Symmetry: D2
Subunit: 246 residues, 4 copies
Amino acid sequence: HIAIDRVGIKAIRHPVVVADKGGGSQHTVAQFNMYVNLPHNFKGTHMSRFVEILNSHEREISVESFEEILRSMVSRLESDSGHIEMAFPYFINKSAPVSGVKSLLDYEVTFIGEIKHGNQYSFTMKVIVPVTSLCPCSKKISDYGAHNQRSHVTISVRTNSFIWIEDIIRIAEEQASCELYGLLKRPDEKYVTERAYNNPKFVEDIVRDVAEVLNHDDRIDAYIVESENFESIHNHSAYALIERDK
Amino acid sequence: HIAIDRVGIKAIRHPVVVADKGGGSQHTVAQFNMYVNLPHNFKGTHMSRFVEILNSHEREISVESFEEILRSMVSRLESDSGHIEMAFPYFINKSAPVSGVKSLLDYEVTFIGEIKHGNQYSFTMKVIVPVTSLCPCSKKISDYGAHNQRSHVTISVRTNSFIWIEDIIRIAEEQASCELYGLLKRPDEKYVTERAYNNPKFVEDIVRDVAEVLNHDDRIDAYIVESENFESIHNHSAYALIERDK
Amino acid sequence: HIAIDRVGIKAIRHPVVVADKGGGSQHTVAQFNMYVNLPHNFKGTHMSRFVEILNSHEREISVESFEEILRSMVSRLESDSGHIEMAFPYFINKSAPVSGVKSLLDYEVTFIGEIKHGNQYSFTMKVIVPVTSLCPCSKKISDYGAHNQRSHVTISVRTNSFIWIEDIIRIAEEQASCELYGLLKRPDEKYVTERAYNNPKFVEDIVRDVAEVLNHDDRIDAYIVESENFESIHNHSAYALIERDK
Amino acid sequence: HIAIDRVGIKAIRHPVVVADKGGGSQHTVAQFNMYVNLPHNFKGTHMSRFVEILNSHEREISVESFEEILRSMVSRLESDSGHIEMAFPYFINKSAPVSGVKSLLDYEVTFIGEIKHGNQYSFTMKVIVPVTSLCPCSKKISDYGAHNQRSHVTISVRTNSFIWIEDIIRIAEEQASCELYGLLKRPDEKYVTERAYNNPKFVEDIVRDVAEVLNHDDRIDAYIVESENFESIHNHSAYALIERDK
């Protein structure tokens, strides 16, 4: 009598493989969310078809698979629009800015697949990159020392060509007050604390500076940029957000 | 140079007051999310104005306050569209279906305020009501015993008149395989287990039956209905969803 | 054949009432955890007796009730040692240090009841108080600006007399680099940023300074003190901990 | 003046490698918790030594490494007792009980290292295995259909020889009402629903039956067994627990 707008499954772990920019690949584990819009004659028993599709490929699911996975999905469930989601930790081995001392840093990356009007596919990637931010307010009023916090710059990007996930990470890291390292030597901490003090940005200043970089990248069709402070002196969170379609 | 689409704060507790249908009111605590779209000449220092507005009213914030709060918000931050959110636990003292033995049940209720084009206000309420659901699949194939699970029927409703939060709860509870009670006597458990067995519904069947009730309520302009199983025999979650505007 | 060491229920919301130091009381909502050690002839059906006991008192449970609740618990379940737990948000209306501008601050308080060897009761309270902390490392090496973060000073205290929860909060807040306020005016932020810069403490320095205050309070029989940084420049958490019995 | 009882870091992701029983190894990602008891002359700057130790080994940390890691830890921080923790998802490709249809199932495994009195090492592993449980209460009173739920059997084991993590998983899975599969065909669901109905166990019955198996394994020095229901008809959680040292 009434059409179901969407059916799907969520909260389902499964091993995945992701390629490094520095030639190679990471073997990690992703949380999944799959669904299909306006399924026809959907019998409630067919819910386990999602799990089928997810297991029918490899032991470790590649991003390459997103093509057939979505194709199988929409056909096996008689809809013409589908959606997949793959959220996983991703590691970069960063070099301390002065010492060169390497240490791993983790980012929450999520790849999002989409298929509409029968066969029209579209890829989107999202990164939650952790940065340190000093706000220029404290810098101005207080004579010595300015308060800083941990921040999360989230960038989601509707892509039209290939982009390394590392590139989008860098855009955020470059644009922040300062980037996080994980292991800091004595000379390193001297650097980053002064580097951040000499480069203070408000929550809106970061999102603005990122948006501006993303406006000009021709591989990006649409984007959402959000940064949020986990306030060092307030116990709440402030956020700013920009979103544009091209 | 580039317009900020939105700025706001989130993750901020504050005591609240909510009226019972059975004359009275609950004194509880809500998590908040406030923001404003397209603020003009927004100085990063003005972020603490949200906290001001939140504290400038009562010790316990009432739903009544949503009017001035949003009005203050959009003016104090020079935007013409704002948004508030108030998520809290809500309690009903339910009577065991056979025994009449009373016990409390908690629901995650969230009130959402909106103000657009200068002064046009709009209210939305959302409830995550816990139900038990037996799926008619097991009922059919297995000779004895059918597997059931805990489910979450989420109903969000763009309202155009007053609705008791209890009413929307009931719509969900009536439409489920069976409702949750919290305290069951021997005769009660005999009832509810058989009641659910004789009333099995798939995840799509529940959302369909709820949507149908909501289509005809003239106090409801738009709605989202979602139910999801925390699968007893699968370790993942299946969900179905319906959404309509009138 | 084999004795069950403990049975209990957890994850159960219920409205509660807590008295303010500044005469009055807060009406909020607590998460519960109840259990009993070495129950005799425990039939699995008796699990719903916990819910009974929890509902058999008031609509809003008081700390006073902990006496009979535990007494009922151990008797109704034939054990001689029981345990209750009551975790809730708690609010203090703080005055900005220079302006006097009042704003609410929330703390995660948890009251813990214990009854052993038949009838020997014992009370314990725990507070997770949010503070800002500057570590004297950055202060030393970098010429200008020192990095700070949000910290959680957790104090749990086996009490032998009455203590206001506010007092234990203060002990933590006084001993921190600086305390959190929620709403800061221009003169206020000037103060707190300099106040913290002139009072830097490592994670171990805070726990040490708190422990020392608690050693001499004769109302405290045993304590656990823990502080942890949500590292502004590292993406992990460091913690220090002290624990003593008297 | 006052001795710090422990210092450490927590909440830190890092890639790991774990061997399969069916010859091989899983490449996944673990959350870490490291600490050292009673460190001498601990300077607050030395906190980043934990991160050093964690990065100084491989890109993917093996369980083998736990020896030197703990040895480095206690020496580099001048204490004689240390502790490491490694929590990660672990996958088994299970065969549907009737069909043989393979699908992955994830378990939350955590390896725990300990080093005391200078050099005395000790290994502990913990598994949170998801099972379905029917309680014999509903089976008895209601004429048709008995209510079941998802359950978590947690087994932590102080080991004195090598044990496959898969073995401990099986102990739990065998002892449950029925085990979870992830993908069920029509004949499979017919089986498992009847299999669980003909094998009902209370929360205490499961922990008792597991404890009994673990009492007789000579590779196990001490254990904690806990199962908890996510109540299908109650909205809270019941749990039972057993713990013994040998």
